[PDB]
């Protein structure tokens, strides 16, 4: 509760039966965010 | 008179039993040319299909459509084989079951194996379609399922038989005769400690066309998850479960055309059960305790 | 520790095509339009393979 | 092949049997047998 | 194909033959298979005109009213083709459940609480769309209303109450509906069979107990013959008045629901 309050603060709205369909038939979970001007965002992260 | 001139027109016209589909089929004709749907009386329906499920239906044709009512929200409806519900009944072999999850669950898969096993199969999340003809591997798999007719080619170039396996055809065999056989889909329920069990699934087959009479000779063979069904029964005040069988009629075909298969695919080889002429009558779904 | 960020980014890009005259074949057959009917319509599926 | 078989014009000839035809596919007097019941659209398949 | 022409007996608004041009996949009920018909007749507003009679009434006049699919309107006549059995059709998807591609279609009464919204209405007449909700829904429709009013004895006390209103919101699949309270005739052919039942049985588990078949009645046995005659003549015909309105006679297989989920083309049966 402390990580998430600190950021990110969704788990799972759905139980583990509807999490295995966001783990297989992976569920677009988070819908375009209400405010985007420069065209879609990206990410990913290597620890060094 | 002139009221009764323009209806002995009418009259005079019917040439056919209908003479109305063959007047629609040639007029389709003329809006561009032979048109590849006159001569059918099987109807069909398009399946848009999750692409991890492009297997043994992509490679053989015949098999058996099932609808997912899967309690899930947001993908709820999966389309299913017949061999798909072999690695959940318990009627089927468990070498049988490992044989097509390494067919089917290649990282796609393994979702409706956990979600057939957990949320268990009320009888209610299944619903027959039909068969598959004209399977489209292309983008997204089409599956052109029938839904009242013979499977074939099209042009009538080659009925499609269709595809039972072994380890859910013979427990429940009719008698030996051939005039005409049905096919019916029955699920039995076995009761354990705990649960349903992952308790069993049939594809009888049987001369018999009324549905008590065919339910008696099923109490014949069920008598053991009876035994169970009654003792869970009396062994629960308050808990319910649901009822032993649940029966429907699924089609008939000439019977004469008994032979048994098998298929060679990804991790082997599977027996099956293949009725060649098997014409597509969805009866509905009859429950018995 | 380092943290090291890697990302892929998006260019849409007109690509310039070019093919020698002839270079492949396409051999193409009639239209063949295929039927499927309803109460709304009848919706014909015309193909060529 | 036997749509081959089928679609070449074929000879007409005499020939002899020993009691049946259907019976011919148990002593098998004709090895590698190919039989027909009614229609076959596996002719008209190319 | 078999055709039924409807007499505009309420003088149409043009605009409204535009939503009758919105329903041309629709299905419409009707008493009786006939060409002729007046328009009162189109719909199961017949039905709905008696404030006493419940949602078994409300069944049973369906049951008996044969079901016809819209073809098309043409201004002052509808034109309604029968549904033939063994053949697809696309019916319009007014019902509060967006169907699924292979769900079989059970037609019910239609239900005024809280999704209250008339209908396509002109001159005074709607004709009343009854939904062709799935045949698995339909049940459980059948299963809340009875034993709702089973409990509609009991409202006084709170925890009976409060076990009415999370009963009474029916979810199903993309969309829930709440549905009123009260079918008394009905649950009383209900607590009859489970009355009776466990009192008139136990002269006769022991004599079928000596010989037996599928060996259970060993298990079975641990769960005046004028009023004998009476009992069991009135336990049977308990189940028979209460089968007439538990079993559903399914009417549409859809084969696949269309986009916008508006229509689905729907293979006809029953």
Same mark, same amino acid.
């Given at each position: ?48 | ?96 079951? =490992?044989?097509?999850?390494?067919? *089917? %669950? ?6 409706? @194996?956990?979600? !057939?096993? $957990? ?111 009654? =003792?869970?029964?009396?062994?629960? *005040? %308050? ?6 069988? @649940?029966?429907? !009629?699924? $089609? ?38 | ?49 | ?46 | ?270």
């Amino acid at each position: 509760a402390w990580v998430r309050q600190a950021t990110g603060a969704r788990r799972t709205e759905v139980l583990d039966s509807e999490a295995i369909s966001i783990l297989t038939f992976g569920r677009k979970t988070d819908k375009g965010g209400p405010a985007l001007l420069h065209g879609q965002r990206a990410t990913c992260e290597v620890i060094l | 008179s002139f009221g009764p001139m323009k209806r002995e027109v009418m009259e005079f016209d019917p040439e056919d039993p209908y003479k109305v589909s063959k007047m629609r089929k040639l007029e389709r004709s003329i809006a561009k040319g032979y048109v590849y749907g006159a001569d059918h009386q099987a109807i069909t329906a398009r399946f848009f299909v999750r692409e991890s499920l492009g297997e043994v239906e992509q490679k053989n044709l015949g098999v058996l459509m099932f609808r997912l009512d899967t309690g899930i929200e947001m993908p709820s409806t999966v389309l299913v084989s017949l061999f798909f519900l072999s690695m959940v009944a318990e009627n089927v072999s468990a070498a049988t079951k =490992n044989t097509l999850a390494a067919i *089917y %669950g290649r990282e796609g898969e393994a979702i409706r @194996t956990w979600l !057939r096993d $957990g949320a268990w199969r009320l009888h209610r999340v299944v619903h027959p379609l039909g068969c598959t003809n004209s399977i489209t591997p292309g983008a997204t798999c089409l599956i052109t399922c029938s839904m009242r007719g013979h499977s074939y080619n099209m042009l009538k170039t080659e009925i499609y038989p269709l595809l039972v396996p072994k380890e859910i055809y013979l427990d429940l065999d009719g008698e030996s005769t051939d005039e005409i056989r049905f096919v019916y889909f029955v699920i039995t329920y076995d009761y354990n400690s705990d649960r349903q069990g992952r308790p069993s699934a049939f594809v009888v087959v049987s001369r018999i066309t009324h549905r008590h009479t065919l339910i008696n000779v099923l109490r014949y063979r069920f008598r053991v998850s009876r035994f169970h069904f009654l =003792n869970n029964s009396i062994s629960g *005040y %308050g808990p319910s479960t649901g009822c032993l069988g @649940t029966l429907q !009629r699924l $089609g008939w075909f000439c019977s004469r055309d008994s032979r048994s298969g098998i298929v060679a695919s990804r991790a082997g080889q599977l027996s099956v059960v293949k009725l060649e002429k098997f014409y597509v009558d969805v009866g509905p779904l009859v429950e018995f305790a | 520790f380092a943290l090291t960020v890697v990302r892929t980014d998006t260019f849409e890009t007109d690509t310039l095509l070019y093919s020698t005259k002839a270079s492949t074949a396409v051999i193409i057959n009639t239209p063949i339009v295929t039927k499927e009917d309803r109460d709304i319509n009848t919706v014909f599926h015309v193909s060529q393979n | 092949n036997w749509t081959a078989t089928e679609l070449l014009p074929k000879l007409d000839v005499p020939i002899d049997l020993l009691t049946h035809i259907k019976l011919s596919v148990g002593e098998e007097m004709f090895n590698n047998f190919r039989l027909y019941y009614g229609d076959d659209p596996e002719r008209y398949n190319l | 194909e078999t055709t039924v022409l409807v007499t505009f007996e309420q003088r149409l608004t043009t605009g409204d033959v535009g939503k009758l041009s919105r329903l041309i996949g629709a299905v419409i009920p009707i008493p009786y298979r006939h060409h002729l018909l007046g328009s009162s007749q189109v719909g199961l507003d017949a039905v709905v005109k008696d404030k006493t009679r419940d949602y078994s009434r409300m069944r049973a006049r369906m049951r008996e009213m044969t079901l016809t699919i819209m073809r098309r309107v043409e201004g002052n006549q509808m034109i309604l083709g029968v549904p033939t059995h063994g053949q697809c059709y696309t019916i319009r998807n007014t019902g509060p459940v967006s169907w699924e591609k292979g769900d079989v279609l059970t037609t019910l009464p239609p239900v005024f609480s809280g999704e209250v919204t008339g209908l396509v209405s002109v001159s005074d007449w709607d004709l009343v769309l009854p939904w062709i909700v799935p045949m698995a829904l339909a049940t459980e429709i059948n299963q809340r209303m009875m034993m709702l009013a089973l409990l509609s004895l009991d409202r006084s006390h709170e925890e009976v109450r409060a076990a009415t209103a999370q009963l009474r919101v029916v979810r199903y699949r993309d969309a829930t509906l709440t549905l009123p309270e009260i079918m008394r005739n009905v649950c009383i052919s209900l607590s009859m069979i489970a009355n009776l039942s466990s009192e008139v049985t136990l002269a006769y588990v022991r004599k079928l107990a000596l010989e037996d078949s599928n060996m259970l009645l060993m298990k079975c046995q641990e769960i005046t013959p004028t009023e004998e005659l009476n009992k069991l003549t009135a336990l049977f015909v308990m189940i028979r008045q209460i089968t007439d309105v538990i079993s559903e006679q399914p009417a549409f297989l859809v084969c696949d629901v269309s986009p916008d989920d508006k229509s689905a083309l729907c293979i006809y049966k029953g």
